[PDB]
Write a protein that binds this ligand. Structure first.
Ligand code: W59
Ligand code: W59
Lengths: 273, 255, 236, 40, 273, 59, 59, 57, 40, 40
C-alpha cells in the first residue's frame, strides 16, 4: 500500500485544495495535492484501532465489599455487608464509560472476571479460606434477604462459587432487550409528567449479589470484590463528540455546576507558539 | 447549467426552491426507507398516509440577533401539531419516520455570520442542577417552539450552555454529526435528509424523540452599517416515509 | 491421565489476553440485529471527519469565541495566529482528533488543517499559511515563514482552504504526549496582502479552523487518556 | 478450537478490516469531485 | 565439515602468512598454512553463540518494593511505597547491560517474568495472601497518585493481577519508535545548549507501577518485586568494543574517576611466562 | 473436562526455558525494519576480527 | 510432560456450565425405558394449553 | 420461519375464532385470524425452554 | 471427545428440537378443523 | 503450535545459521587473495 505517491510541480485550473466546508463534507485532501512528494508505503494496517480491539480489554467496572462475621443479632444482613448486590450497570466507574460513549448504540457479549481479596484489619490468628458465591439476580426474580436465604439455592439462576484470592470468569451473551444497548436515550418510560429521563429506565438488568459461603470464625474478615468487564464481538453505531466535562451520575449526561474551563488558555497571544 | 446551488424539493403537495444551496447532507449516507419485514417485530399491518403526512411543515420563525445563543428542536416533537402528521402521532401506539430538514436564512453581500445546522441522534440533555436531577418531560417536549438556548435556566428543564451541547461535550466536536453550515457569504439554506435511526424497528412517538435539530450562530451576525441588527431564521421540515402502527384511543401526554 | 507441567504465569489475569469462557446463560437467544445507519469499524474512520479547533484560546472561561480567529482590515505584512503542533495538547487537545490521539501512545501521518472564511461576500483577502518542520523556531515574520511549507490562500467564492501538514520526520513515529525529540513543528498564518472590507461595512471578520487526519495516519499502542478521571464511583 | 457450545463464549472477534469513512466524511447528496469547484 | 584438511611440506613463492595489517583486514589464515596437518572434522555448529541464544535467557532487570499497610494519614502513597513505579529501562542492572552493549542497535520482542515474594520483618500472626497488580503506565497516560486512584481501573492500559509468591509472565512486542533500539546515541533531543545527551532522551517508554490490591491487615507486609527480561526474535547490528570500566549511570557511557587499571600487570617481565 | 496429572517442576521459572506467552499489546504494529549495514548473527563471526593485545603489561 | 498455563476462572464452580465427569457407578446398567404417553420436550409445548384465569379476583 | 403471515380484510362464512372449549381442545388461533397482519419472522428457536436446559443447571 | 467410558458421564443432551403440543392442546378423538364449526 | 495470535508471543527464534564474518574481517575495497602479496 502506498502512503504517498510521487507527485511533481502543478500549474493547473484544477485546484483540489479550495473547497466549501459549508457542505458538511471533509474532502479527502493529501500531501501530494499541495507539495511535491516521493513514494512511501504504509507498512501498517490499523489493526489496533478496530472497535473490537478498542473495547476488547478488561476494565474495572465495580468494586464492592462484603464481610464474614457472626450474623447473630444482625437485623439487616444487607446493611451489615453480610452480602451485597450491585444493581448491575457499566457507566458507574468512568475510564470505560468515556470509551463506550464515543458511540450511541453498542452491541457485544461480555466476559466478566471477578477478583476477590481478603483483608483482616484487626488482630486475627490467621487468614481463613473463604469461598465467595456471586449470583445473578435478574429482575423479577426475588431478592435475597439474609446471607443464607432460600434464594441462594439458585436453582434456576446462574451462580459461580470461587475462593477469595482467586478469580472467577465466565461470559454472558448480549442480554439487551433491543438490537443494541442505548448509550444514550432522549426519552422516558412513558408519557408521565414526573417520570425519570435518560437510560436508567432502559438499560435495566437487575443485579448480581455476592456473599461468603463460610460461617464465621472468631475474627472478622473483609472481602473486597472487583468486577472487570471485557466486550467481545463488538458492534458500534453512530459516533458522537467525546465527553468533555466530568460525570455526576450513572445514566444522565449531567455535568457539575461551576465546573472549570476545559479548554487550556494560552500563556500568551493567539500569535504565540 | 445545474449548480450545486439551485435546488427544488417537491414532497407531497409542497415544494421548496433554493437558489443558493451548498449541496445537501444525507445522514450517514442513507436515505429514508420503510421498515422491511426481515426487521419487523410487531405483527400489525402499518398505515402509510403518504402524501398527507409527507409534505413540508414550516415552523414559526426565529430571530437571529447579535446576542443569540442558538435554538434546539426535537423530532418528532416539533411536528406534534402539524396537520394529519400530528393526529396520526397521538392516535397510534407506534410510528416511524425520516425527514427532510430545510433551514433558511438570507441576508445580503454586506452581512457576515455563520450558523451550524446539525442533527444529533439520541440527544439526551443534561439537567443544569448537576448530580442526578432529571429533566422533566415538558422541558424536552417544547413542540414547535423548540428550546431557546439563550432563555434562562428553569426548574426541571435542561442546561442551555452552548459550549457544551446541552450534554457535557464541546461545541467544536458537533461536526462529527451530519451537519451543514449557513455562511451568509456562501449559503442561504441548509438541507439534511434524516433516515430513521433507532435500536428498535419502530417506537413510541411521544415518549422518545430520536433526533434534535440544532441551529447555532458560531460567527456572530454582523450587519452592514445602520442596517437593522437582526435576520429571521425559518425551519421547514417534512416527514418522509412515515408509517404508523397500533391504532387505538389517542394518547394523553403531560401538560 | 495425560502428564502436564504448568509454566510461570499460570493463574495470572492479564486484562488484555483473549480466551474462551463458559457462558453463564447456556442456550439463550439474543435479540435479532436490525439495520441502523452509521456503523463505525475503526477509530481511523472517524478521525478523518474534521472538527473545529478552539484556536483563539486566549479567553478565560470556555466560550464560543475561542473558535473564532479574528482578522483586521487593512493590516499588511502581519501575523494572524501561531501554534506548535503538539496534537495531544494545547489547541488540538479537545478536538476529536486530539481526543482520540490521546487514547494512543504513538502517531504518524499527515494532518489536514483548513480555514473557512466568514467575512462579507464583497470583501477580499490573501493569507499565507506556513508549516515549519521541526528544527527551526516558530517563524517570527512572513519572510521567515514563507521559506517552509506554505499555501497563498486567495479568499473567494470557494470559502475554505485545506492545508496539509505533510509528514516530515526522521523517526517514523512521534509521541502523542508532547516530547522534544519527537516534536513536529509550528503552524503560522500572515496577511499576504491584507483583508479589505466593502463600504458600509466594519469591524472584525473571523475565520473558523478545522483539523482532521489524512488517510496516511497511523496511531498505535493504546493507553489511558489524561482527559478523564474521577474521585468516587458514581451512582444512580 | 472452540471448547464451548455457545457463541458468546468464543474469544474476541478479528479485524473488521472494513473501513469506509465516507458515511462520515462525505455524506453529501450530490457527489463532490476533488479538484472540481465545490460550488458551481 | 572439515575443521582441518591434510597438508604437507611447502616450498613456495606463495606465502599466505605474510600480510599487511595496515589494510584493516584480518586475513583468514589457518593451521594448515604454516604447519603440516591431518584431516579432522568440526563436529560442531556454533548453535549457542547465535545472538538469539546469547540474548535469549531471562536476566534480572529490576528489583523494587512496595508494602501493604494502613494508608490512613499517609500524605504521599508513592513515598510510603504504598506502590511504586519503575521508569522502565534495561541498562539499570548491568550483567545484561554489558551483553547488549556489544551491539549498537538491537531489535527484539520482550518476554517479562515478574516474581513477587513477601517478607514480614516484624511480628505477624500470619502471612496474608496478597494479589499484586502491575500495570503499564506508558507516557502520556496519567500517573496514579494514590494506591487506589481511578488510574488503577486501567480500562485502556494492559495490567496483570497475580499473587505474591507466584510469578506473572506476558510478552510485549518491540515497542521502539525507530527500526531498532539505540544502544548508543551521540546526539541530543534538539539543538539546545543545556539539553541532556545520550540515550535517556531517546529510549523513552514511560513506566510500570505496581501496587497490592489487598486492603491492610493488622501487621505490615513487605513485598519485593523482581522483573526478569528475555529477548526473543533478536536482531543486532554493528558490533563494538566490550565495556571495560564500571558503569555509573543509566544511559551515559561515563565511568568513575580514579578507577583502577583494568589490564592486569605482569608479575615479572615482558619475558615472563 | 480432560484428565491431567502435573509433574515435578510445575510452576518453576527456569531463566533458560523458551515458551509462548500472551502479548500484553494485542494487535500492535511494530515499526518497519529499514536496512542497516553491519548485522551480527553469531559471536563466532566477530571473534575472527583481530584486536591488539596489551602484551607489554609491565606498566 | 506437556507445558500448560492455567487461566483466570480455574477451579471455579459455575452452576450452569456443562462438562463431563467420572461415573461413580462404573458399568451399571439402567432399567430399560418402557413407553409412557405424555412426554414433554419444551416448556413452549405446554404454555399453549389454555387454563382458567381467576379474573374475578375481588374476593 | 414466519412468526406472522400477511393477512387482509375477511368477510367469510368460515369463522376460526368461534369454538367450543367444552371439547377439551385449545384451538390454534393466531393474530392473523382476527386482525390484518404483515409478515414477520421468528428469529428464535426455543432452545432455552428445552426440558434438558430447564432441569440441567 | 468423551474422556470417560460410561454414558452418564457425558455432558448435557442437545435440544430435543422435538416440539409437538398437539398431545396436550388437541387430544380430541374426532379431528377439529379451525374455521369449521366446533359442534356440527 | 502457536496458541496465541500475535507474533511477539511465540518462542525464541531458531539459529540464524547465517554467519559471514567478511563484513567485519575483510571490508577492503580491492579484494585480497591469501598467498598473493598484500601490497603490490
Ligand atoms: C455505558 C452505556 C450503556 C451502554 O451499555 C451499557 C450496558 C449496561 C449493562 C449491561 O449488562 C451486562 C449484562 C450483565 C449480566 C450478566 C450476568 C451476570 C452473572 C453472574 C453469574 C454467576 N452469571 O452471570 C450491558 C451494557 N450501558
Ligand atoms: C540497553 C541499551 C538500550 C537497548 O535497549 C534498550 C531498551 C530499553 C527499554 C525497552 O523497553 C521494553 C518495553 C517495555 C514495555 C512493556 C510493557 C510492560 C507491561 C506491563 C503489563 C501488565 N503489560 O505490559 C526496550 C529496550 N535500551
Amino acid at each position: 500500500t502506498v502512503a504517498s505517491i510521487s507527485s511533481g510541480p502543478k500549474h493547473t485550473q484544477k485546484v483540489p485544495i479550495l473547497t466549501a466546508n459549508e457542505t458538511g463534507a471533509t474532502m479527502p485532501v493529501l500531501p501530494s495535492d499541495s507539495i511535491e512528494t516521493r513514494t512511501t508505503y504504509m507498512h501498517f494496517n490499523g489493526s489496533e484501532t478496530d472497535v473490537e480491539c478498542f473495547l476488547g480489554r478488561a476494565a474495572c467496572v465495580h468494586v464492592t465489599e462484603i464481610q464474614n462475621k457472626d450474623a447473630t443479632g444482625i437485623d439487616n444482613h444487607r446493611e451489615a455487608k453480610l452480602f451485597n448486590d450491585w444493581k448491575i450497570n457499566l457507566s458507574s466507574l468512568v475510564q470505560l464509560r468515556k470509551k463506550l460513549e464515543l458511540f450511541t448504540y453498542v452491541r457485544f457479549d461480555s466476559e466478566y472476571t471477578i477478583l476477590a481479596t481478603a483483608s483482616q484489619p484487626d488482630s486475627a490468628n490467621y487468614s481463613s479460606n473463604l469461598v465467595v458465591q456471586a449470583m445473578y439476580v435478574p429482575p423479577g426474580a426475588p431478592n435475597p434477604k439474609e446471607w443464607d436465604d432460600y434464594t441462594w439455592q439458585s436453582a434456576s439462576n446462574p451462580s459461580v462459587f470461587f475462593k477469595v484470592g482467586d478469580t472467577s470468569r465466565f461470559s454472558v451473551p448480549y442480554v439487551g432487550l433491543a438490537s443494541a444497548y442505548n448509550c444514550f436515550y432522549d426519552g422516558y418510560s412513558h408519557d408521565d409528567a414526573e417520570t425519570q429521563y435518560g437510560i436508567t429506565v432502559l438499560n435495566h438488568m437487575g443485579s448480581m449479589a455476592f456473599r461468603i459461603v463460610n460461617e464465621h470464625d472468631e475474627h472478622k474478615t473483609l472481602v473486597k470484590i472487583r468486577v472487570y468487564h471485557r466486550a467481545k464481538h463488538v458492534e458500534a453505531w453512530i459516533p458522537r463528540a467525546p465527553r468533555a466535562l466530568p460525570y455526576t451520575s450513572i445514566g444522565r449526561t449531567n455535568y457539575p455546576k461551576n465546573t472549570e474551563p476545559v479548554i487550556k488558555k494560552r500563556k500568551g497571544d493567539i500569535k504565540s507558539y | 447549467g445545474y449548480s450545486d446551488r439551485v435546488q427544488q424539493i417537491t414532497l407531497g403537495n409542497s415544494t421548496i426552491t433554493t437558489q443558493e444551496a451548498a449541496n445537501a447532507v444525507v445522514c450517514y449516507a442513507e436515505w429514508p426507507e420503510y421498515l422491511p419485514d426481515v426487521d419487523a417485530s410487531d405483527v400489525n399491518k402499518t398505515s402509510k398516509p403518504d402524501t398527507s403526512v409527507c409534505r413540508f411543515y414550516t415552523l414559526d420563525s426565529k430571530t437571529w440577533t447579535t446576542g443569540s445563543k442558538g435554538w434546539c428542536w426535537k423530532l418528532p416533537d416539533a411536528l406534534k401539531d402539524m396537520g394529519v402528521f400530528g393526529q396520526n402521532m397521538f392516535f397510534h401506539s407506534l410510528g416511524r419516520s425520516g425527514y427532510t430538514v430545510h433551514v433558511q436564512c438570507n441576508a445580503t453581500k454586506f452581512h457576515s455570520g455563520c450558523l451550524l445546522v446539525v442533527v444529533i441522534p439520541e440527544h439526551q440533555l443534561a439537567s443544569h442542577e448537576g448530580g442526578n436531577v432529571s429533566v422533566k418531560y415538558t422541558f424536552t417536549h417544547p413542540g414547535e417552539r423548540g428550546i431557546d438556548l439563550s432563555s434562562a435556566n428553569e426548574v426541571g428543564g435542561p442546561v442551555k450552555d452552548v459550549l457544551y451541547n446541552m450534554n457535557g461535550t464541546l461545541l467544536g466536536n458537533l461536526l462529527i454529526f451530519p451537519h451543514q453550515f449557513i455562511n451568509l457569504r456562501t449559503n442561504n439554506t441548509a438541507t439534511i435528509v434524516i433516515p430513521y435511526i433507532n435500536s428498535v424497528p419502530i417506537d413510541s412517538m411521544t415518549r422518545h424523540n430520536n433526533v434534535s435539530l440544532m441551529v447555532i450562530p458560531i460567527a456572530p451576525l454582523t450587519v452592514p452599517t445602520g442596517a437593522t441588527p437582526s435576520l429571521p431564521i425559518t425551519v421547514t421540515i417534512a416527514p418522509m416515509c412515515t408509517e404508523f402502527s397500533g391504532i387505538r384511543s389517542k394518547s394523553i401526554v403531560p401538560q | 491421565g495425560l502428564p502436564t507441567t504448568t509454566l510461570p504465569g499460570s493463574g495470572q489475569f492479564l486484562t488484555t489476553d483473549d480466551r474462551q469462557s463458559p457462558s453463564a446463560l447456556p442456550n439463550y437467544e439474543p435479540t435479532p440485529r436490525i439495520h441502523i445507519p452509521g456503523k463505525v469499524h475503526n477509530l481511523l474512520e472517524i478521525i478523518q471527519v474534521d472538527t473545529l479547533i478552539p484556536m483563539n484560546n486566549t479567553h478565560t472561561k470556555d466560550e464560543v469565541n475561542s473558535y473564532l480567529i479574528p482578522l483586521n482590515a487593512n493590516r499588511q505584512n502581519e501575523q494572524v495566529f501561531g501554534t506548535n503542533l503538539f496534537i495531544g495538547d494545547g489547541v488540538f487537545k479537545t478536538t476529536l482528533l486530539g481526543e482520540i490521539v490521546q487514547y494512543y501512545t504513538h502517531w504518524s501521518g499527515s494532518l489536514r488543517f483548513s480555514l473557512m472564511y466568514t467575512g462579507p461576500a464583497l470583501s477580499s483577502a490573501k493569507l499565507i499559511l506556513a508549516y515549519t518542520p521541526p528544527g527551526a523556531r516558530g517563524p517570527q515574520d512572513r519572510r521567515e515563514a514563507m521559506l517552509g511549507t506554505h499555501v497563498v490562500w486567495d479568499i473567494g467564492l470557494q470559502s475554505t482552504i485545506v492545508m496539509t501538514i505533510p509528514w516530515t520526520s526522521g523517526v517514523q513515529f512521534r509521541y502523542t504526549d508532547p516530547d522534544t525529540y519527537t516534536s513536529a513543528g509550528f503552524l503560522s498564518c500572515w496577511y499576504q496582502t491584507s483583508l479589505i472590507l466593502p463600504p458600509e461595512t466594519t469591524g472584525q471578520v473571523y475565520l473558523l479552523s478545522f483539523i482532521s487526519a489524512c488517510p496516511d495516519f497511523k496511531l498505535r499502542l493504546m493507553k489511558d487518556t489524561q482527559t478523564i478521571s474521577q474521585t468516587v464511583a458514581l451512582t444512580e | 478450537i472452540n471448547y464451548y457450545k455457545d457463541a458468546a463464549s468464543t474469544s474476541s472477534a478479528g479485524q473488521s478490516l472494513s473501513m469506509d469513512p465516507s458515511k462520515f466524511t462525505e455524506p453529501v447528496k450530490d457527489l463532490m469531485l476533488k479538484g472540481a469547484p465545490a460550488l458551481n
